[PDB]
Symmetry: D2
Subunit: 421 residues, 4 copies
């Protein structure tokens, strides 16, 4: 146990009275609305989102990185920190690894995971940066690089990610690359995309029968003029071209200003190509901020689409959700905790929507009551539900407060040496 | 008189009184545990008012089409009758803002009708973004900043007329939003156009009563698609600062560039004493003029967080002239204004719930996570019971839209008004 | 017929003939030093055409107001007379795109008038984004994707009628742009609305002759301010792929989210054979519908770079149906359409100057600087002499707007057509 | 000379004939337009823009930095490379230094500058990152930090920058900070600004009589929710509040999407607060791309405002222009050369605008002819003017071609060791 049980118990007991009052008050209010709070809590306690191993360390910008104390030294320290998030929120049982940052003996990774009560989600390849001893640089691209040898090198890297994943229990490979151009004319849009499609087709052939290959679009950054996989349209063309095992990932902050992101989610689901959603929030670009910290309603609207799919009876829909954030000015663990909380919060609210009433207002084109039907769910404070779900599953009623009371950060700060060079 | 039968209001209130008592008492207990007296909040909420636009009671449209509903108001008198419903049921919109010449009519009759309906009059709104019948000079190429002196003079005179009308009905301010700008690079000389605007506004200011305020409203684009004279809050500040103490800036939510941090603009204008008021609506793409809070309710809350913080910081002489400015293209205008007025009080109530002492502590200690969580604890609170009880206690409806529909008001005016 | 007196055209051409010869010969020498034959470029420019929207010759407006000019066209026939002026002077707009029901009239008269004016007819345009007098079902909440079956059927029938009208006048395509969408979250179920749209379009598709095309046009927003059924090229692609071989996508410059790489979308649609055509205009904020190239001329060039690259790589079965779609709120509509058609040919001509071999080399070598400079060398070239000479040799004017103004055309039609009144837009 | 004179002479003679033909042809065309090409050329050869010392090194993103060969390390290597840009373009005689990156003995800096034929422009302070041994971190801000000692440290650093500047011939201090917040509530907008204003007042007091203090606004990055100096409005409030010696800098890529930047330039000039413009181009955010590579017309429209002011000599209008770009996928020297070229290009074209005719069309509301009057200038290919201006002043007809012919990059590659073979 990363966090002492007596601490979790103590902090839970301290807040039990208030939780009881709020939960029972909410339960009665929901009952008057025809909703069984117990049915909602039962589903909330089973909603999981993968945590990125790279999100536990402090992030930075091109201008600077301001590390906190006790920064994880490697993947094993990162898993240790991910275990804190899972123990306290019970919403992040699986961790997504990034290669080569997290490269290590697969057996040791699996053993540590099992010891901490953590599983492993989708593997993530890295061809947006150069690793030591690399025969070819990814400065001008990777999977879509003009140089055949460079693409082959990128392909082999992705195949290695699959091998590592097969050894630790992973069932998917996520591919996000920075490939693109910074100047008009620098790249031939079509040929670059063709090169990418050819390389991804090779990676696709290395997929086990029960694996998925996820491609992730991004409007810009690192490329500032054009990006090969720039939007969901190109992303759909990729997944449709590659095959049944290839699907698209939607990262909230990877879209143009004012984009209706929830619609993209709906479109991909309709055509069976929504592999998963990567959570974070943003205001300007791919800010990678804590989920729901900027636009909580948008997060709820994305979940409304995810829940409606289930309501419509979409078959074989098992998206692979993951948080992908950079924590530049907070304790990474605390941000991941509250971000996972916001995600469950939006999910819980989406479950409260009176779909029967909504379908009626939609058919009669009663726009005001339709939007108000969504708002009645979104306006509901579901914190008591989230808190009870945690209590029941061994988590903390107030995760961050408990984390702080445990003195975990100070503890790892004394155990881990800060990098000097 | 009452546009909505008092027995319908009573009936629809009693029907929901039991559940409201339950929700209000529960929220009261929760707030008490948080060191907040729900009664103090309700008391402030029932005193929060936002002006309704006379032009918002009719169905709006786009350049592609307008799809009117039934019982559309024929003139300003029908509009006042409809605005009276919004005030009667929400009790949050006691004042109506008129637009000239659309609402031109015997000011004396307007005031009489207002008093009878329990409505007051807010800021006057001039119109030099469209041509009126018999108008000598067209505003096609501008008004107050038009290159032709005679055209600017006509625009100035029109604004002065708006003032005369407002003085007769109890208005204490003139809001100036013009479409002046250009659609092509080179069409206008940015500086000369602005100089002309400033000189024209100075004439209006000269004729402004000393118990009135003059509001200028910035807009990034539309109707101008390349440049706009009063394009942003920076230019707006220059205008207000140049004109005088009685001149201030109006911030309309949907009038900013994509991703703009609007709540910061609000804070900046307050700090320099030039925030005349805020015009509410919501948007996703541009100046969509949608129902307030229908798209980004948190942003609305953040704007109110700055308004409430101004009081908390002890800012003096701060009395913003708030107004709703929306276009209702696919809903019953009355229902939208009702729920928009509600959303505005909702964000206000949540802002009142912010533990300012705690927030200040987290800000000084640079505890970003707890600081943002402190705002969220307020925002996540469902204040609907407070809004409903405030309405119930002041003569309004627990559920305004439900009561509105139960009254059959729309069917009623549809029969009294042409098709 | 000649809307503009031939003597005026000749007069204004002779007046500028000397300077043109000097500039054309100078550019010719410069291009020669660059291994380019100016005659080869002029020859292609003279053959580049873009359809003109019938509704574009009238003064446009916003939801706040409309400020009509003098001599506003009363209907399709007046509009055709005005379009004829654009074609006569620029020689770049031989075909006109009709909009129904605005231009509804006897197919025989339409065709007869076009022939007399030297105008052909391009893609038909359906209108289910507004209500017409006596209409049985309102399109307030949608049309092809409306929740009401009868409303959808009415919309389908209207579109089929557009195809019938087009078959009688020489048209070979139907363009479908609707405002269908929502203004509030929850108002529409995104997926169900799209399913309804697809099903309705499938019915329209069934009525397409074997040599006809069906074009769907995406738009991020307006009139819908929360969601739009056909919101972007991604959805547009799904439509075209679902409907069939005869269904393709139209890309309207100002219909994209801020900062979108529009030229890439063009390339993507070409790669997958679904580029139905490009609708020209320019913008700075949203769907401003401004004169092409008036705001971002380089972006216009970059779009043409993708079009010309395809036109050079032999891309078979590539005959995009280009059209101008602009709103002229503060200029004489005819003059704007004239200079817009000119800007389009300007971008095209510059794209033709790109050294494709050199560019290909810099791309393979990842020489970003020289690759971008290769495009700039073409774009920086002032091809006005080529455009003017192309017009001169084909019966057009060296300086179209100058000739238009010298002819007194506007004042003429102003004296023949009833006066128009200014007013407010759909705002109220 | 960084570049051998014989190479410059050889590559000039190689293109002399074609240049003579084009310059004469353009001179004749301009003559027919009532314009004297010589008057334009004379001004163009005198138009200068400062080069950032940090611009000659390869730039990167938060994902990676892909260095080229012969990367300059330290201000001395950087000045050596900046000298190449000046020798070949003759448009960048002054270099802007950044402290502490360029910290060195002033006498040695001044000595090296004079030897290379380079002067020193505005000083640039750095409180958006932490230097080793720093007492207080700038993680949560600097000049506007809640901690007094942190603000005092930032103020002292800026004063040290002025001291360094005084010793090498600089006459201004540019202040761009990352100060802001990533979460709603993290900062109190008004209080943070009050602290900033108070700290800048202290810096202003240390300004010599002939010095200027420039504040630079930026919408976002590194702050992803709010930024203290977020736009020109706040920037104006700063300059007007500080005093006569304080003005505002406008960096092209620091604005919200679709912003009309040329209008901002005009507004600041009208109120005497345009301290200078920082050139670069962009498509998505603060991309810091080569000037004019994305939107050359916008660059021309900005210069249309600058030239209009220059023609009349507006009170307080004496801009301190500088290039501020990041070269992530090109040879930094080549990009700076062609960027400086684009800047002079737009300047030259703005010089061609028939102001009398334009004013006439503006007064008559003839929008079509007014815009066409600008286009007639913009459509003019002024390359012959730029090339002749360089040739007449000791520069190269074709800067990049001459740079490549000289083999400079391979030369410094041999003198400077890369991190890896």
């Amino acid at each position: 146990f990363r966090i002492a049980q007596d601490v979790v118990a103590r902090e839970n007991d301290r807040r039990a009275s208030a939780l009881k009052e709020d939960y029972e008050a909410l339960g009665a209010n929901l009952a008057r609305r025809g909703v069984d709070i117990e049915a909602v809590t039962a589903k909330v306690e089973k909603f999981f989102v993968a945590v990125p191993s790279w999100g536990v360390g402090t992030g930075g910008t091109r201008f600077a990185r301001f590390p906190g104390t006790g920064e994880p030294r490697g993947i094993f320290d990162k898993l240790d920190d991910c275990a804190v998030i899972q123990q306290l929120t019970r919403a992040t049982p699986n961790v997504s690894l990034h290669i080569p940052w997290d490269k290590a003996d697969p057996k040791e990774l699996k053993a540590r995971g099992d010891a901490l009560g953590l599983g492993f989600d989708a593997m993530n390849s890295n061809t947006f940066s150069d690793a030591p001893g690399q025969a070819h640089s990814y400065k001008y691209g990777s999977l879509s690089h003009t140089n055949a040898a460079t693409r082959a090198q990128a392909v082999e890297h992705n195949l290695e990610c699959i091998e590592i994943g097969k050894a630790i229990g992973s069932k998917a490979l996520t591919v996000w690359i920075g490939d693109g151009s910074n100047f008009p004319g620098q790249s031939n849009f079509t040929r670059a995309f063709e090169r990418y499609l050819s390389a991804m087709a090779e990676i696709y052939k290395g997929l086990p029968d029960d694996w998925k290959l996820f491609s992730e679009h991004k409007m810009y950054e690192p490329a500032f003029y054009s990006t090969v996989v720039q939007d969901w349209g190109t992303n759909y063309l990729i997944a449709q071209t590659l095959g049944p095992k290839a699907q698209c990932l939607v990262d909230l902050g990877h879209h143009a200003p004012n984009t209706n992101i929830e619609m993209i989610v709906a479109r991909l689901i309709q055509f069976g190509k929504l592999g998963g959603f990567h959570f974070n929030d943003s205001k300007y670009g791919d800010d990678d901020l804590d989920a729901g910290a900027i636009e909580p309603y948008r997060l709820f609207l994305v979940f409304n689409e995810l829940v409606d799919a289930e309501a419509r009876g979409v078959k074989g829909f098992h998206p692979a959700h993951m948080i992908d954030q950079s924590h530049n000015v907070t304790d990474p663990i605390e941000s991941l905790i509250n971000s996972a909380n916001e995600i469950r919060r939006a999910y819980a609210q989406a479950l409260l929507v009176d779909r029967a009433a909504l379908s009626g207002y939609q058919e009669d084109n009663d726009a005001l009551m339709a939007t108000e039907t969504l708002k009645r769910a979104y306006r509901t404070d579901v914190e008591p539900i989230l808190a009870e779900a945690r209590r029941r599953t061994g988590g903390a009623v107030d995760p961050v407060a408990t984390y702080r009371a445990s003195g975990y950060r100070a503890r790892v700060a004394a155990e881990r040496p800060a990098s000097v060079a």
